[PDB]
Design a protein around this ligand. Structure first.
Ligand SMILES: NC(=O)c1ccc[n+]([C@@H]2O[C@H](COP(=O)([O-])OP(=O)(O)OC[C@H]3O[C@@H](n4cnc5c(N)ncnc54)[C@H](O)[C@@H]3O)[C@@H](O)[C@H]2O)c1
Ligand SMILES: NC(=O)c1ccc[n+]([C@@H]2O[C@H](COP(=O)([O-])OP(=O)(O)OC[C@H]3O[C@@H](n4cnc5c(N)ncnc54)[C@H](O)[C@@H]3O)[C@@H](O)[C@H]2O)c1
Ligand SMILES: NC(=O)c1ccc[n+]([C@@H]2O[C@H](COP(=O)([O-])OP(=O)(O)OC[C@H]3O[C@@H](n4cnc5c(N)ncnc54)[C@H](O)[C@@H]3O)[C@@H](O)[C@H]2O)c1
Ligand SMILES: NC(=O)c1ccc[n+]([C@@H]2O[C@H](COP(=O)([O-])OP(=O)(O)OC[C@H]3O[C@@H](n4cnc5c(N)ncnc54)[C@H](O)[C@@H]3O)[C@@H](O)[C@H]2O)c1
Ligand SMILES: Cc1cc2nc3c(=O)[nH]c(=O)nc-3n(C[C@H](O)[C@H](O)[C@H](O)COP(=O)(O)O)c2cc1C
Ligand SMILES: Cc1cc2nc3c(=O)[nH]c(=O)nc-3n(C[C@H](O)[C@H](O)[C@H](O)COP(=O)(O)O)c2cc1C
Ligand SMILES: Cc1cc2nc3c(=O)[nH]c(=O)nc-3n(C[C@H](O)[C@H](O)[C@H](O)COP(=O)(O)O)c2cc1C
Ligand SMILES: Cc1cc2nc3c(=O)[nH]c(=O)nc-3n(C[C@H](O)[C@H](O)[C@H](O)COP(=O)(O)O)c2cc1C
Ligand SMILES: Nc1ncnc2c1ncn2[C@@H]1O[C@H](COP(=O)(O)O)[C@@H](O)[C@H]1O
Ligand SMILES: Nc1ncnc2c1ncn2[C@@H]1O[C@H](COP(=O)(O)O)[C@@H](O)[C@H]1O
Lengths: 197, 197, 197, 197
């Protein structure tokens, strides 16, 4: 099976999580894992001025989504929605939609916020789009044990992995957060192999 | 693969839809399909005095959901949520939750409304509960081409089959609506057999 | 203005929060604040066996909702939805709906979960019901400063106050959680007076 | 009270609805109503080559939203979410967020879809972003009695006005749809004047 980890990141938090997801997915022997990013939509000079992080990942086209058996979407929260960059990208998949190109493919979502609020809503509002495409939606439930831990501040929900970046973005993803992100990649990649070989 | 079509119906619209879903699912070679209702929560006298319909499907126990590979949930809308009866039943699946009994099982959802409003929210808000169980969520997308028919008042969304019951319940599910419901059963059953034999 | 704090609680967490909400609302000079609970739906012996907390609050009827200018709804999460008890109660407001009895009234929601997951979804799925009734929906945004604090585990979202009860229910609402709950009561009661006198 | 009707439209359906909303709002004594569009994000050549409609409403700046007492947001659906253009615009309101510039302001939402699917999700998922700003959210409930008309294909939900554009965009908003949209403007404007003068 081919698994795409398709993300948007301004400051690197989602990018770090995406690498944890790909690393989890890679544990699955029949799974070929690819990590790509959506295009930046901001002017490059404003991106740079805002202290945006440069990223090595190749840039995806909307069309190449059809080449995968499973897509794990990563996006920071913008007021409890996916980011304008991710939304802009998915608004270009009308050709794919009209030809049934993602129908029955697997979809899963991870997210990042500054102080936690909106992390659930970002994921489940992304599911809505995946559903219009007839994609099978993969939540993580409570198989990741770190989800039971209330002793430290941490991202992660039954809908998908998440990280808390802090108000100023100074937090890095915790071990527990990355561990849930690895689980998500393992689980979705296992389902992709199970369905598609 | 074993498929449970689990429903709540007061006046029989969801019951008709549940039957159509079961029929679709029964077309799939390898699929064993069962239809059950959740218990009524209203006082019996009040259910009867409001005109509740008597139904021949047996009543489910929470425990027995662990026996299926796929569960297709049918509920009428109560102000854009699942019914109290369905909610109350699901609130008794905490033991299943703690043991991971529904984890990784296929889940799908159909609904009914008086005049259409709330049908999407009913389905997607049901998905949330399915996700806490780690169930794999199956929307229908636009494969059912009746979804493109805007020439007549018609239930059905990319989230799941729906029907429009009328303000007073006098409408019966239309043939287009029943087609989409049969498609949903067949598609979910097909997936269950692919994954489980 | 008359403000109802209408809650469901099994183990007292929502009940403690409801008192914080009423206490906040009481700061508003033109506001008359009442705290009521929805009926338990469980058999009394099973409630007691489960270690359910006895509560002094009077029990509301669905009809008396029409007597208030603002209702602040409190419910524990059941898999990212409101509780079967709250849902059952609201399923009895069809008379109110058909006569426009809650149209333009204010509505706001607070919540409680064991380990945090589903707290946003419980609130926004409750909003859906409030919207069918034409109620004006009151989120809290980020006026409660504790919402910026990521140094300790804590409930509270831009949608409404929340508390983390712990997996076994052994956590009590924190000072920061109760403080956000007080803000919610102040703010909604102030809006109710502003609109209705 | 000042009312902004802020919209995105590609082919003019939401533009027609925005106009109907403004008209309704203009009927309210004391209400100053303004209509603006968010910037186009597509390359101009591609917007034109797809058949985008040229529009006489001026383009909004994020900053100017601080000048209104009520903002009625209009967006077509993109797979059950607001459009990329609207999302991108809202993603530039972070400065407004940090200063509480929209806090406590009235917010309301209308939408458009090709065939109906996603219209509810588009609206409620827009509400989430409004809540992070602390805006007071206004659904329409069932006051617009056309919402009870199941005799004809008809947009509109208790969440907000909607229209059905057809698969190819050839449908124009119907008189019932336009009535509900005018009702929404008038109702939100009435509320703004009650609260703000
Ligand atoms: N918040 C973090 O995770 C984080 C991390 C590192 C640094 N920072 C610092 O925070 C400061 C700014 O805050 P911020 O970036 O969190 O949010 P912000 O909303 O204040 O601003 C980022 C800038 O980019 C613009 N912008 C954001 N999305 C856009 C889009 N889709 N299209 C066009 N313009 C868009 C905004 O209008 C803004 O001017 C920066 O100076 C940066 O160094 C924050
Ligand atoms: N809408 C239909 O499909 C339909 C069909 C036949 C008859 N009717 C009639 O229309 C009238 C009302 O229609 P309706 O039933 O659609 O709406 P409703 O809300 O007015 O009626 C349901 C009745 O049962 C109660 N009820 C509903 N769910 C409950 C729950 N979970 N727990 C406790 N009580 C609950 C309500 O309080 C109410 O008394 C009734 O008199 C009924 O006889 C409607
Ligand atoms: N979770 C907490 O906040 C908390 C607090 C105090 C004590 N406890 C302890 O946890 C144990 C049980 O766990 P639990 O209550 O968290 O969840 P649970 O799901 O395991 O069970 C509570 C019992 O009530 C039933 N139940 C719950 N809602 C119902 C409804 N709407 N209608 C009919 N039956 C319903 C369940 O089926 C179950 O048998 C108890 O023995 C209790 O002492 C938990
Ligand atoms: N649906 C209508 O109201 C309507 C009206 C007139 C013409 N058409 C025609 O139908 C065809 C497709 O219809 P459609 O436009 O509804 O769907 P579509 O998705 O197929 O077409 C939109 C075109 O613009 C692009 N696009 C859309 N949003 C974008 C964004 N935010 N950023 C970058 N690119 C974006 C898409 O990639 C595509 O190339 C077009 O050829 C168009 O001329 C449709
Ligand atoms: C426009 C905008 C909206 C935001 N909305 C929220 C929010 O609703 N909740 C939150 O906790 N953080 C919010 N933030 C913070 C971002 O989600 C955070 O910076 C992001 O998760 C970092 O991920 P990244 O480093 O990969 O870009 C917002 C930031 C911006 C710029
Ligand atoms: C409490 C209550 C809430 C309802 N909420 C809605 C609603 O939000 N939208 C709608 O169109 N119909 C609503 N109705 C109608 C029911 O959804 C409808 O009668 C039901 O779908 C019929 O299905 P059934 O025959 O299977 O019971 C409501 C009815 C009741 C009693
Ligand atoms: C049926 C059921 C479902 C539950 N679902 C969740 C959940 O999704 N997320 C969570 O963190 N806790 C969940 N819990 C924990 C309850 O939300 C928690 O016990 C409640 O918030 C305590 O509030 P109260 O003391 O007022 O009753 C669930 C508990 C039960 C019994
Ligand atoms: C990227 C994309 C996604 C779309 N998603 C949906 C959808 O989920 N449901 C639907 O009925 N129409 C969908 N359509 C149709 C648009 O919602 C419709 O053309 C629009 O509402 C017309 O409004 P406007 O003329 O104001 O642009 C989509 C179109 C595009 C380009
Ligand atoms: N069968 C499994 N194999 C590996 N990890 C699992 C499994 N089930 C749950 N996990 C979780 O996956 C995450 C990563 O752990 P690991 O896969 O051991 O590096 C943790 O949250 C574990 O609790
Ligand atoms: N104008 C205000 N008056 C009182 N409390 C406020 C106000 N604005 C925000 N708050 C918040 O309300 C909560 C309770 O504080 P207090 O009202 O001072 O007991 C805290 O979260 C404060 O940050």
């Amino acid at each position: 099976a081919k698994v795409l980890v398709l993300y948007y990141s301004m400051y690197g938090h989602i990018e770090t999580m995406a690498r944890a997801v790909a690393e989890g997915a890679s544990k699955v022997d029949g799974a070929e894992v690819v990590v790509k990013r959506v295009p930046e939509t901001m002017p490059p000079q404003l991106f740079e001025k805002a202290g945006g992080k440069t990223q090595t990942a190749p840039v995806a086209t909307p069309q190449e989504l059809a080449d995968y058996d499973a897509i794990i979407f990563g996006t920071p929260t913008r007021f409890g929605n996916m980011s304008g960059q991710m939304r802009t990208f998915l608004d270009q998949t009308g050709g794919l939609w009209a030809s049934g190109a993602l129908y029955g493919k697997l979809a899963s979502v991870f997210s990042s916020t500054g102080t936690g609020g909106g992390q659930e809503q970002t994921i489940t509002s992304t599911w809505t789009t995946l559903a219009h495409h007839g994609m099978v939606i993969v939540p993580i439930g409570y198989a990741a044990q770190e989800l039971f831990d209330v002793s430290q501040v941490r991202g992660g929900t039954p809908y998908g992995a998440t990280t808390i970046a802090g108000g100023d973005g100074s937090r890095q993803p915790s071990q527990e957060e990355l561990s849930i992100a690895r689980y998500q990649g393992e689980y979705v990649a296992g389902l992709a192999v199970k369905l598609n070989g």
